[PDB]
């Protein structure tokens, strides 16, 4: 995924 959360 590109970012967390």
């Amino acid at each position, epitope marked *: *995924a*590109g*970012x*967390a*959360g």
Partner: antibody
Amino acid sequence: VQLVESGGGLVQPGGSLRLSCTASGFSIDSYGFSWVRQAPGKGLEHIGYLTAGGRAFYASWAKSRSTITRNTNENTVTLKMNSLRAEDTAVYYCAKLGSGNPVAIWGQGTLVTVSS
Amino acid sequence: DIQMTQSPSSLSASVGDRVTITCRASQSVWRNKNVAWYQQKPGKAPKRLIYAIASLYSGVPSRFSGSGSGTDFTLTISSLQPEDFATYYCVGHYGSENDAYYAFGQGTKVEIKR
């Protein structure tokens, strides 16, 4: 592609700041957006992150007083901070930080001065 | 929560010198990928130079480059120029599928010896 900021200036201690960035040329829910601030002469401080999935996370120092939201209809993201003290005087920025992606976009920043 | 420590906190170097700034995270960054480097000149907004540890933004000169793995990272200015006077910040992304955090190093001021 722009991210013009609004809502800064002179604020009284004990009051609240409300800051908004209006995305010009794209949709605000496309990317996650951070709020960052820099007190005069000091370094950069991360306030919180609103992930493109919509969940807001805050640094521990800011969790008590801060709420970050977005209005997809408005094409804006918003920082709300209350119980302001002199230590909150800073240039405030909204930005997709681009720690890992080729896209990075920053507002021009607005100074918030907390003073009576 | 998370911390990031840059070293040194300030430095002076000559035009043409190779300059190295080390960043160091308190945890592993997201995917061991999400570290960027920013440059801030006086009275200007911060400007991103490097993203994903080593990718160079197309608007930035190729004398900037990054490297590092896991929790320790490096910015290299290969041939220092007068216009590189600035404060340089690393920024890191952190968290899980249920956590999202960003942290900045304290900044490294680069001064030009002349």
